[PDB]
Amino acid sequence: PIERVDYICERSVVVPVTYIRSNGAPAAAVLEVEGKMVALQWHGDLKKYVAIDEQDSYRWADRGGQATLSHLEADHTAKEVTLLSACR
Amino acid sequence: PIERVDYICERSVVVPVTYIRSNGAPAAAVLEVEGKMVALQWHGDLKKYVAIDEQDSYRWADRGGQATLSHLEADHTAKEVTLLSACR
Amino acid sequence: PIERVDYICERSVVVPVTYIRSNGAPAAAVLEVEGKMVALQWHGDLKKYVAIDEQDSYRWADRGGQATLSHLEADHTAKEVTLLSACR
Amino acid sequence: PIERVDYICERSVVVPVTYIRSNGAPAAAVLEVEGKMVALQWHGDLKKYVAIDEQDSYRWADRGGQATLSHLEADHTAKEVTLLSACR
C-alpha cells in the first residue's frame, strides 16, 4: 500500500509524506523536509520511522492525527531535537 | 529495501527518487518533480512506475543508467508526454 | 516593491514567483521551477525576464493573466524551449 | 544587482537566497526555507530582512560569512525564534 499524506506543522509548514506499508505493517516513509527528500524505515522497537542515512537521522513519529519530526545528530552527546509537531 | 537515488536530467534538473522494493521486486517509487512529491507504484505489465494519483499520472521508467519521467493527462485523446530523460 | 505571485501551469504545476520592481519598472523576478531557485533580470529589449545564469537561461515572460517559462541552452544551435504556459 | 547565494545551515540544510540590491543598498531577499518561497524586504532600522507577509514573518539577518533565519509569530506574546544559523 502506498499512501500520500500531507501534514501541516507550525508556521504552516507543509510536510508531504508517502507511507509505504508491507503486509499490514508500516515499512517506509518518504518525506520532504528542510528542502531534502528523506527516506525513513519503520523501526518497530522505537515505534518511529528512522532515516536510512545514519548521517542525517531524521525521525518521524506517526501518532494518528499528530506527528513529530525530530533529528539526532550522529554524536554520543547529541540528543533528539524536535524540529516540528505536525497535524494531517 | 529502501534506496535513495538522485537523477540528473536535462537542464541539470535533479530528480530525487526513493525506491522501495518488496521481496526482490520493485514496488514503489517516490520522487520530487515539478515541485510535487509523486508517489508511484510499480506496474509489472507496463514495466514502469505509475503515479497512484490517476489525475496526475506521472510515469517513471527505470532503465538502469537512464530513466524517463513521462506524464499522461487523464483523457482518451491524451498521449504520454516525455517530461525528462534522466541519468543517475 | 516586492510582490509574491503564484502561477498554476499545466499538470497543476505551481510556479511561485517573487517580482521585484524598481521605480515603476520591472527589475527582477525570482522563481522556483524544476527544483531550482532561478533569479532573473528584466530585459526591456526582449520584454522578458532572463536568468542571470547564462548557463541555465530560463526566461519568464509576464503577459498579465498568462505567463511562459522557457529555456535556452547555451548553444548557437539551441532554440528557445517552452517549458510551461502559466496562469496566475 | 541580483545575486544568488546558497547558504548551508545546521543539518546540512541548504537555504538558497536571491539578494536584490538597489543603488548600493540592500532592498530585497528571496529565499526558499521550510518548503516556502519567502520574499523579504530590507529593514535598515532592524538591519535585517523581514518577510513581506506579516502572517509568516521570517527574518533573515545577513552577517557576511554567517546568516540567521528567524521567525516571529504574529502575537504580542511571541518572541523571535531562531530557526537556522547559516554559512555561505
From TrEMBL, chains A, B, C, D:
Superkingdom in the source lineage: Bacteria
Cysteines paired by S-S bonds: C9-C87
Protein name as annotated: C-type lysozyme inhibitor domain-containing protein
Organism in which the protein naturally occurs: Brucella abortus biovar 1 (strain 9-941)
